[PDB]
């Protein structure tokens, strides 16, 4: 593949020099999607192709020939997780219930299109972003089937942002957008050997996205490099009246995150290496040891630290997600006039189509969520507050303050596991604190264990994306650990 592992800036430079145009790049990815996603290894990372992709690419080329460039992403093809609204494609969250539901563009999609990006299509995801049943299988949806890990197709691509991570790793697009509530961006990113960035809740509008939790939800870029992730973040970040969370950002400005790509970004930094059982995961010691060494040689101070209240928010998070899921999903159904208007309708639909929807696992989360008393319930209010406090101020922040640290690092998760009828064989995580706190996290490829990707996670306090990008980029540039999957 002529564009394999080529950065956004490099592709833009090529198009700007007139050695490449958007239609050629776009058709190249589409041909690759046909050869690896639908056939061959059958990655099934792409759930629907944008019928107007070629039309869009052609328009971006005409604008370029007319001297009307939109910016760094002009003519760059990307993919969107299927819970993000994007006309004229359907937005199903992987469900058969919304197969013919085609709402208008989400705010971030409008920003990407205005930036000149070309939408290739939508990527598969764990159905309903994995908030449907117990013992679920990551990367599976009734409409998109089973997405597979490109490094070993018998293994899990993890998730919920399964297709986005796989598409990026397999070079099916330049970059992709995923969403995270608790691990959905960074876990599949690490599992598939790519970069995943989950920003602070409030940096990127959640408007036009099928939700789970307004307290923890956020869209984020997935790319093969930190530089590409930074270019995408620059395009999607911004205040939106439709999403109150975006009005809480302190001193928001037209910020160019690519300006933070500093090769000396680790000099003078202080990093805390989290002491979790993940450091002892089979084959992990050598990798994390080498990573710490690279960070130190780069000029950073690395000290072992433990996260206060690790996991103490578990119960509170469960409660807040169930309450917020019902409230948010029903608001979304009404706002975009979906064919379903209540969670009860969805539960009923799955039962009526049990053969196609409930053959692998059930819908117990939907059922429990539908029974919640609403957002005025004192129990929910207390849970929402406790979770945020335990993971942020008294969690990540307490750890950062204890040793005056700039960030915390740790292996993101373990390696991919074989896909089986049974639920996922979850190895563990170190990213939940950031997800529950609503703080930024970013994973960068750190190496492999027996051919399967492992990532290094960076977590920081609210609004520290600039600093995290600097550190992650500096680390990435002296390691360049990503290795494409072999087909």
């Amino acid at each position: 593949f002529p564009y394999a592992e080529t950065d956004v800036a490099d592709l833009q430079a090529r198009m700007t020099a007139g050695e490449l145009d958007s239609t050629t790049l776009t058709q190249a990815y589409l041909q690759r999607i046909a050869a690896l996603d639908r056939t061959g290894p059958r990655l099934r990372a792409v759930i629907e192709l944008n019928p107007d992709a070629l039309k869009e690419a052609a328009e971006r080329d005409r604008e370029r020939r007319d001297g009307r460039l939109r910016g760094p992403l002009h003519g760059i093809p990307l993919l969107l997780k299927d819970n993000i609204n994007a006309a004229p494609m359907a937005t199903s969250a992987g469900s058969l219930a919304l197969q013919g539901f085609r709402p208008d563009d989400a705010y971030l999609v409008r920003r990407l299109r205005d930036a000149g990006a070309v939408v290739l299509g939508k990527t598969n995801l764990s159905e309903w972003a994995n908030f449907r049943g117990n013992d679920s299988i990551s990367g599976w949806s009734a409409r998109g089937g089973q997405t597979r890990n490109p490094y070993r197709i018998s293994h899990s691509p993890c998730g919920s942002s399964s297709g986005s991570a796989v598409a990026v790793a397999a070079n099916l697009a330049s970059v992709a957008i995923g969403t995270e509530t608790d691990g959905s961006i960074v876990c599949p990113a690490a599992i598939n050997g790519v970069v995943g960035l989950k920003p602070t809740v409030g940096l990127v509008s959640r408007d036009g996205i099928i939700p789970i939790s307004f307290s923890q939800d956020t869209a984020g870029p997935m790319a093969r490099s930190v530089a590409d992730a930074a270019a995408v973040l620059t395009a999607i970040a911004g205040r939106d009246d439709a999403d109150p969370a975006t009005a809480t950002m302190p001193g928001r400005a037209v910020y160019d995150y690519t300006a933070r790509l500093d090769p000396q970004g680790l000099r003078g930094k202080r990093i805390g290496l989290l002491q979790t059982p993940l450091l002892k995961y089979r084959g992990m010691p050598p990798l994390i040891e080498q990573a710490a060494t690279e960070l130190r040689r780069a000029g950073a101070v690395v000290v072992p630290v433990e996260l206060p209240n690790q996991g103490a928010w578990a119960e509170a998070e469960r409660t807040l997600l169930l309450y917020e899921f019902k409230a948010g999903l029903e608001r979304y159904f009404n706002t975009h006039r979906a064919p379903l208007r209540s969670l009860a309708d969805l539960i009923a639909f799955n039962q009526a189509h049990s053969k196609q929807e409930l053959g692998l696992f059930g819908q117990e989360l939907l059922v429990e969520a539908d029974a919640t008393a609403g957002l005025a319930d004192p129990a929910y209010i207390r849970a929402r507050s406790d979770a945020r406090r335990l993971a942020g101020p008294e969690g990540i922040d307490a750890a950062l303050a204890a040793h005056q640290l700039d960030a915390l690092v740790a292996p993101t998760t373990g390696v991919a596991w074989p896909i089986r009828s049974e639920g996922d064989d979850f190895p563990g995580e170190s990213y939940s604190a950031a997800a529950v706190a609503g703080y930024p996290s970013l994973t960068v490829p750190m190496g492999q264990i027996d051919g399967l990707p492992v990532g290094l996670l960076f977590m920081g306090t609210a609004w520290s994306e600039p600093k995290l990008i600097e550190m992650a980029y500096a680390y990435e540039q002296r390691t360049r650990a990503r290795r494409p999957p072999h087909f």
Binding site: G183, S184, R318, F426
Partner: peptide
Amino acid sequence: FXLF
């Protein structure tokens, strides 16, 4: 409560 994983991977939403």
